[PDB]
Amino acid sequence: TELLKPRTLADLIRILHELFAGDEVNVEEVQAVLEAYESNPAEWALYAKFDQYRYTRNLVDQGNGKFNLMILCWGEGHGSSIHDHTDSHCFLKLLQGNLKETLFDWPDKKSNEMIKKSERTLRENQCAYINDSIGLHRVENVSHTEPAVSLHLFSPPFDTCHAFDQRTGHKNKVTMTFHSKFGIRTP
């Protein structure tokens, strides 16, 4: 599979439709092409719709029936739950700012504190990857001064996941909602 550098976000999307044309996913190739796209704010401004109070999920492309590509917009101090990814691949590329990713193991059945296994700072243009076999994660914009924007690819698409209570490991199902689709706010 000949991987070329995406020239623009639209070019990236076209390449992703090629990489997901089939039934399986070459994770390292997808991550490499996502990393190789150099974030250009003008190309994704349409999708980068923020909310004052929490991070937003903005659908960019529905894929070929095979993936959701979305842009998440994180105000200062906004972060996620500890969550899984519903048996899907998750790629996360930073378009602007920085995000802290904290990794957790799947809890045991016993109620116990969830102790982080590691953390890392994801920086502009870097692409991280996670799936349920790797573990769970929390993603947070810990900046006090800089909003963050990330590009997420989920394959297959999913609209529910679990949030985990860090104090006990207990999980609850959450339905994920789109703040916008294709540049259009969807209340």
Asked if 98 contacts 149 with a C-beta cutoff of 8 angstroms, the reply is no
The answer to whether the annotation marks 137 as part of a ligand binding site is yes
Q: What is the dihedral of CA 133, 181, 62, 52, to 10 degrees?
A: -20
Instruction: Identify the CA nearest to 164 among candidates 97, 100, 115.
Output: 115
| Dist. CA 51–CA 144, nearest whole Å | 16
| Dist. CA 143–CA 76, nearest whole Å | 5
The answer to whether the annotation marks 170 as part of a ligand binding site is no
| Dist. CA 102–CA 75, nearest whole Å | 18
The answer to whether the annotation marks 83 as part of a ligand binding site is yes
Annotated binding site: 83, 85, 137
Annotated binding site for Fe cation: 83, 85, 137
